[PDB]
């Protein structure tokens, strides 16, 4: 999918126009550039071993692959290699970079694709084949796992509602921190773009149940996390 990057396109249009004139006989120009353009488009034809390949990457994986490629391409052109050497070098590199990209896409699916273990992530994906950008909802369980927090008598109580995937999600609004009373009732304690809640130098009253919601425009919460806080009469 790496031809979806405007930079890759120009670097190709620079190889043809700036590099080929002084480093390959003109008989090979149209033919080899025909082959190069086709090779790079073929970055989207992937097999992937197992699991199967979906035809989507996130924008990071896409950038990642364009970088590998264009740094490699560039090494060649700083080298000033000509003729046959140049063609071999050029075509080894394309071959390696495809295989490399393949490993990006594989890693992307195993680890970056709908990476959330709970909640609902809005992931911006891109379709290899048409360079088209979509937003896809990864909907998982609402159970992020219960956070049991032990905090010493008079130290800070930090409640972190941040998940690693939150920074990669679309449509987030605010984190709202609730206090749950035992009444099966609650009070809004905090709300903003802060992912944490700190009641410093806490005390025995401050123990109990807390709750974090992460909102999304404009619908159901992206994340719910529950904390149970127990304060310890201790050092
Ligand atoms: C619910 O229980 C807590 C217990 O401390 C209390 O502070 C709160 O006022 C109760 N709810 C209402 C509506 O009073």
Curated annotation (Swiss-Prot):
Coiled coil: none annotated. Residues 1-235 are extracellular. Izumo is the name of a Japanese shrine to marriage. It comes from Homo sapiens (Human). Residues 146-230 form the Ig-like C2-type domain. Belongs to the Izumo family. N-glycosylated. Glycosylation is not essential for fusion and for proper protein trafficking in sperm. Phosphorylated. The cytoplasmic C-terminus is phosphorylated and undergoes phosphorylation changes during epididymal transit. Essential sperm cell-surface protein required for fertilization by acting as a ligand for IZUMO1R/JUNO receptor on egg. The IZUMO1:IZUMO1R/JUNO interaction is a necessary adhesion event between sperm and egg that is required for fertilization but is not sufficient for cell fusion. The ligand-receptor interaction probably does not act as a membrane 'fusogen'. Acts a ligand for the human-specific oolemma epitope FCRL3/MAIA during fertilization. FCRL3/MAIA replaces IZUMO1R/JUNO as IZUMO1 receptor after sperm-egg adhesion, which permits species-specific gamete fusion. GO terms for molecular function: identical protein binding; protein binding involved in heterotypic cell-cell adhesion; protein homodimerization activity; receptor ligand activity; signaling receptor binding. It is found in: Cell membrane; Cytoplasmic vesicle, Secretory vesicle, Acrosome membrane. This is Izumo sperm-egg fusion protein 1. The chain holds residues 22 to 256 of 350 of the full protein. Monomer, homodimer; disulfide-linked and homooligomer; depending on the context. Interacts with IZUMO1R/JUNO. IZUMO1 and IZUMO1R/JUNO form a complex with 1:1 stoichiometry. In gamete recognition, IZUMO1R/JUNO first binds to monomeric IZUMO1. The weak, but specific interaction with IZUMO1R/JUNO induces IZUMO1 homodimerization. The process follows a tight binding phase where IZUMO1 bends the entire structure towards the sperm membrane side through a thiol-disulfide exchange reaction. The molecule no longer binds to IZUMO1R/JUNO and instead binds to a putative second oocyte receptor. Disulfide bonds join 1-128, 4-131, 114-138, 118-144, 161-212. The lineage of its organism: Eukaryota, Metazoa, Chordata, Craniata, Vertebrata. The gene is IZUMO1. It comes from the Eukaryota. GO terms for cellular component: acrosomal membrane; acrosomal vesicle; endoplasmic reticulum membrane; membrane; plasma membrane; protein complex involved in cell-cell adhesion. It is a single-pass type I membrane protein. Glycans are attached at residue 183.
């Amino acid at each position: 999918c790496v031809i979806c990057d405007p930079s890759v396109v120009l670097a190709l249009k620079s190889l043809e126009k700036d590099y080929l004139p002084g480093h390959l006989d003109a008989k090979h120009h149209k033919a080899m550039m025909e082959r190069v353009e086709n090779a790079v488009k073929d970055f989207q034809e992937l097999s992937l071993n197992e699991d199967a390949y979906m035809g989507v990457v996130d924008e990071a994986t896409l950038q990642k692959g364009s970088w590998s490629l264009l740094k490699d391409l560039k090494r060649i052109t700083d080298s000033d290699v000509k003729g046959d050497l140049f063609v071999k070098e050029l075509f080894w590199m394309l071959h390696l970079q495809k295989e490399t990209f393949a490993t990006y896409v594989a890693r992307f699916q195993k680890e970056a694709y709908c990476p959330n273990k709970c909640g609902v992530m809005l992931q911006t994906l891109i379709w290899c084949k048409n360079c088209k950008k979509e937003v896809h909802a990864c909907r998982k369980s609402y159970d992020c796992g219960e956070r049991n927090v032990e905090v010493p008598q008079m130290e800070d109580m930090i409640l972190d509602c941040e998940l690693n995937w939150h920074q990669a999600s679309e449509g987030l609004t605010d984190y709202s921190f609730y206090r749950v009373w035992g009444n099966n009732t609650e009070t809004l304690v905090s709300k903003g773009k802060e992912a944490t809640l700190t009641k410093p130098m806490v005390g025995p009253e401050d123990a109990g149940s807390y709750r974090c919601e992460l909102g999304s425009v404009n619908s159901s919460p992206a994340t719910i996390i529950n904390f149970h806080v127990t304060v310890l009469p201790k050092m």
